[PDB]
Design a protein around this ligand. Sequence first.
Ligand SMILES: CC(C)CNC(=O)[C@@H](C[C@H](O)[C@@H]1COCc2cccc(c2)[C@@H](c2ccccc2)NC(=O)c2cc(cc(N(C)S(C)(=O)=O)c2)C(=O)N1)C(C)C
Ligand code: NA
Ligand code: NA
Length: 334
Amino acid sequence: GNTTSSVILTNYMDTQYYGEIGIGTPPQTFKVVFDTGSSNVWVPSSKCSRLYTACVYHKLFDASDSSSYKHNGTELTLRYSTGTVSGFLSQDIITVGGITVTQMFGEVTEMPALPFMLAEFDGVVGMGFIEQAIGRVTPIFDNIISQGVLKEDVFSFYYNRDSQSLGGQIVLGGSDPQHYEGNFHYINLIKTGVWQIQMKGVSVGSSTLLCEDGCLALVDTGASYISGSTSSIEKLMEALGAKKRLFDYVVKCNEGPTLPDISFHLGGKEYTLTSADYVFQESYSSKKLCTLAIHAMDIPPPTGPTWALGATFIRKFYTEFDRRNNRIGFALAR
Ligand SMILES: CC(C)CNC(=O)[C@@H](C[C@H](O)[C@@H]1COCc2cccc(c2)[C@@H](c2ccccc2)NC(=O)c2cc(cc(N(C)S(C)(=O)=O)c2)C(=O)N1)C(C)C
Ligand code: NA
Ligand code: NA
C-alpha cells in the first residue's frame, strides 16, 4: 500500500513510553507499551478480581460493553523476564494510529501488584514475531501487514528525552526523518522470530572489557534500560565503581558526570553512550546516590544469554524494525 501511520507516545519520567489503543465498539481506550521483546496484546479485564489492586488502579476491558467482541476464552499465561500476567483470549476491533484491525488479545484477570501498580500504562502491545507469541496468536503487526495498506513492512521507534513536547513516536510502515539525522546503519537478525542481532563487543572507556567473543543484543522497546547477563554486568559495574543495591546499581552523584563511555559494537558501527545517557543525574551531591540505566537480566536459552537494548539506547538511536529484510537499522535520533 501507501499508508504510513503514527502512534504518538507519552514519555513518563524517561522510563515509560506508552501510547493509546481503542478496543471494541464503541472504543474502550487503553494506555499500552509497544514491546518488541514480546508478541501478544493484552489489557486488564473487567473480570479481573479487585483483590488485585493493579486491577483497581487500571482501565479494564468490558466485553459486555462491546458489540464487536467475539468470545474465545482460551486460558493464557504470559511470563515476561520481570513479571507475569494471566487471563483468557478474546477478539475485538483494535484501533492503533488510525488503523483498525481485528485482533485476538488477552483479557488479563491476574495482574500482580509488582510491577503493575508502578506502571502508568494499562497493557502491552507486542511488536515481536509470531514465533514468540504465547498460544500461537497472530500478532497485531502481522494482522496489519495482511491488510496490505502499509508502504513498507517496517515500523520505527522514536523515544524523546523527558521534559509542547512529543514523548515519542511509532511509525507503522516507515520511518520519520524529522527524528533522525545521518543515515541508517543496518544489522541482520540472527534469525527471523526475534528482534535480536549479533553484537561484536562492548567496550567501557576504550577497552573491549566485555563480550570479547561476540554476544547477542535483543532490541527491546518494552524495557526502559540496557541490560546484560549477571556476569557481564558484574564486570561492567566493577569498571564503573558502582554499588549493587537490590534492583539497580548506583554511584555517588558527584561521580556521575565523570563515568566513562560505554560502546556497543553492532554491525560495524560503534554505538556510544556517555555518562549523561546512562546516569539518572538527580543531583550532583556527594551525599546522594544516583541510579544507572543499566541492569542485570538473565534470559534462558534459546533466546538468551543476551544483552537487551531498551529505552536508554533507543532514546539516543532512532530504531527501525524491518520485517521485509529481517534487520534492524539505527540512526542518530534528534
Ligand atoms: C514470552 C517472551 C517472548 C516474553 N518476552 C520477554 O520476556 C522479553 C521482555 C519484555 O520486553 C518485557 C515487557 O514488559 C513490558 C512492561 C510491563 C510492565 C512494566 C514495565 C514493562 C516496565 C516497568 C517496570 C516497573 C515499573 C514501571 C515500569 N518495565 C521495564 O522497564 C523493564 C521491562 C523488562 C526488563 C527490564 N530490564 C530488566 S532492563 C530495562 O534492564 O532490560 C525493564 C521486561 O521484562 N520487558 C525478554 C525476552 C527481553
Ligand atoms: Na512497595
Ligand atoms: Na521497585
